[PDB]
Amino acid sequence: SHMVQKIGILGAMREEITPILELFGVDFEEIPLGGNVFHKGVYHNKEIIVAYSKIGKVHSTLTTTSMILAFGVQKVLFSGVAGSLVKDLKINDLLVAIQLVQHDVDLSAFDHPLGFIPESAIFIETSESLNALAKEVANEQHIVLKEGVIASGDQFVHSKERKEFLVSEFKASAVEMEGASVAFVCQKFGVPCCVLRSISDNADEEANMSFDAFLEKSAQTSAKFLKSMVDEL
């Protein structure tokens, strides 16, 4: 029914949604579609649709589209982990993405700026309203929540040279592989989106080792915070 509010909650990997399903604690019906498993439950009278997309831009575009078109979700909250590009963002710290960019798009051979695609824009915006809510919830929990630009692309970044490019070209604070495609799809449909990330690594030569040591704790941190936001919705 259109009288039932529907909220999509997305992560990229199983580990990013496991804690979400546990924290919400209601029974979820499993519904397979398009290679994804959607978990549908009712929490405080809201239908919550939870899924992990699998990694990267094509997987996350597909899953966000299914949530909106097939499940009729009217907000998307994305939760997961990211690599830090700035010294003040340390392991486990939370960032909300005020703008996102696809950092790997390169049509500069035809004089477009890096990150730009025709009919689109370098920077994609998220919901003022939901980010304002994230800030209120962080303040009300005594959690430090940074706001910044997140760069997304289909490579796991693990080099000083790529980090330096991300900071100089886009002034990005963190890097990951899905945010910009989820925020893009939500913008095309006019659906409010929030992208929350907790830092798992520093996107440098050691990033794989950090990512594996910290993924689960960082995914839990983001997942708890997302649950705090749904509790105020």
Ligand X SMILES: Nc1ncnc2[nH]cnc12
Scanning 76-84, 88-96, 117-125, 187-195 for contacts with ligand X by CB under 6 A, the matching segment is: 76-84
Taking the C-alpha atoms of residue 50 and residue 25, their distance in angstroms, rounded to an integer, is 12
Active-site residue flag, 27:
no
Summarize the annotated binding site for substrate as residue ranges.
Answer: 83, 157, 177-178
Measured in degrees and rounded to the nearest 5, phi and psi for residue 27 equal: -80, 140
Of 226, 218, 227, nearest to 83 (Cα)? 218
Span 11-50, contacts to a copy of itself by CB under 8 A: 34-36
Of 231, 170, 228, 226, nearest to 198 (Cα)? 226
Considering the candidates 88, 128, 201, 212, report the single residue annotated as catalytic. 201
| Binding partner selected for residue 82 from a copy of itself, ligand X, none, CB under the kind-specific 5 to 8 Å limit | ligand X
Q: Is 219 in the site for ligand X (CB under 6 A)?
A: no
Residue with Cβ nearer a copy of itself (141 or 155)? 155
Token digits for 103?
A: 């950092």
Given a contact cutoff of 8 angstroms between Cβ atoms, the answer to whether 182 and 57 are in contact is: no
3-state secondary structure of 80: strand
Span 148-187, contacts to a copy of itself by CB under 8 A: 154-156, 158, 180-181, 184-185
Of 71, 60, 183, nearest to 127 (Cα)? 183
Active-site residue flag, 16:
yes
Residue with Cβ nearer ligand X (73 or 100)? 100
Considering the candidates 15, 16, 93, 154, report the single residue annotated as catalytic. 16
Taking the C-alpha atoms of residue 31 and residue 46, their distance in angstroms, rounded to an integer, is 17
Binder among 107, 132, 144, 233 for a copy of itself (CB under 8 A): 107
The site for ligand X (CB under 6 A) is made up of: 81-83, 156-158, 175-177, 200-201, 203, 207, 211
Catalytic residues: 16, 201
